[PDB]
Design a protein around this ligand. Structure first.
Ligand SMILES: Nc1ccc2c(NC3CC3)nc(-c3ccccc3)nc2c1
Ligand SMILES: O=C(c1ccccc1)N1CCCCC1
Length: 337
């Protein structure tokens, strides 16, 4: 049977949540989030209410994608669904989607207020372990950045799908910047590299003002593409653009990252590689020496397979609406431990 819902008004917007969640308290805005108390488990949680989940076909797909992705994530360094619920009693009236997950307080972006090498080691290690699991499901995150990294006071880290209301572009792989349709998983590794760099130094590696500037700054550090990468660019335009640029030499990373752990610097070298067929993977980075005190092959799991064939379907608004509803209805709480 269904539980007792109860109603209140909040950030101008309205919230009809179950009895079980108490003391809602907005933390800021795709949707807005409340910190609340979960009387069933005793823990503080975040309740995200989706804004306009079914406003267009693209919203309806996005809303479904997000539910599928969250329902699939079962791993310590990746955000999982505690609960999904709606005020609606039937498909016909189904209109609002709420998502519940563990509260974690802060995000890397705002905890950056320069860490020690043990900390960045533990922080990046946990990201990589998260990416292992995500990547093993054929899922790419694409927008890895500080605000999408949630960290409790235990220094425990979880990859968020979407974070609090700092540019996207600063952490994007150059091939995504050049609009390559065919990028692999290691666009996320690039992001990690940029984040690690920011923790070790306290400075955004590539603070570009736009997508041209952004690429400028990247090539300064990592050099213009050699001929081996040059020949993989299937686009006259791009090829013209960078082959027209001034030939920058690949800087020495131990000169730029002075007095960082030379193991840290090694890893950064292996992550900020221009050519994405050569970038270290999440799985291979975990075995890097830099994480020797954390690395445990027996405790770095992979995900169950994830069906994303839905990504290719062109479906009616009411069809995505109803697939979501099925996902809400078929939801199994994780065990309470
Ligand atoms: N195996 C790869 C590795 C890296 C690549 C990359 N990124 C490099 C910084 C230039 N860019 C491109 C590409 C292709 C078409 C249009 C624009 C860019 N392809 C790449 C293929
Ligand atoms: O955006 C969310 C969220 C909330 C509920 C379900 C999924 C993600 N969070 C943001 C950072 C604090 C933890 C949760």
């Amino acid at each position: 049977e269904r539980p007792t819902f109860y109603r209140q008004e909040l950030n101008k917007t309205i919230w009809e949540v179950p009895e079980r969640y108490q003391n809602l308290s907005p933390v800021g805005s795709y949707g807005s989030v409340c910190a609340a108390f979960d009387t069933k488990t005793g823990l503080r949680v975040a309740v995200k209410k989706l804004s306009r989940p079914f406003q267009s076909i693209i919203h309806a797909k996005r809303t479904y994608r997000e539910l599928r992705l969250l329902k699939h994530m079962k791993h310590e360094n990746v955000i999982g669904l505690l609960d999904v619920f709606t005020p609606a009693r039937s498909l016909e009236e189904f209109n609002d989607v709420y998502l519940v997950t563990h509260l974690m307080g802060a995000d890397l972006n705002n905890i950056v207020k320069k860490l020690t090498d043990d900390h960045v080691q533990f922080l990046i290690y946990q990201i990589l372990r998260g990416l292992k699991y995500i990547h093993s499901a054929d899922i790419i995150h694409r927008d890895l950045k500080p605000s999408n990294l949630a960290v409790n006071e235990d220094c425990e880290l979880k990859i968020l799908d979407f974070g609090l209301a700092v540019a996207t572009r600063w952490y994007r792989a150059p091939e995504i910047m050049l609009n390559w349709m065919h990028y692999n998983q290691t666009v996320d590794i690039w992001s990690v590299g940029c984040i690690m760099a920011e923790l070790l130094t306290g400075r955004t590696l590539f603070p570009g003002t736009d997508h041209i500037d952004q690429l400028k700054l990247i090539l300064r550090l990592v050099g213009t593409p050699g001929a081996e990468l040059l020949k993989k660019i299937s686009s006259e335009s791009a090829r013209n653009y960078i082959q027209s640029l001034t030939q920058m030499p690949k800087m020495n990373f131990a000169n730029v990252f002075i007095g960082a752990n030379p193991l840290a610097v090694d890893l950064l070298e292996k992550m900020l590689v221009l050519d994405s067929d050569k970038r270290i993977t999440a799985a291979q980075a975990l075995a890097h020496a830099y994480f020797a005190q954390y690395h445990d092959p027996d405790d770095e799991p992979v995900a169950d397979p994830y069906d994303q064939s839905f990504e290719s379907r062109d479906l009616l608004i009411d069809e995505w609406k109803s697939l979501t509803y099925d996902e809400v209805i078929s939801f199994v709480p994780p065990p309470l431990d």
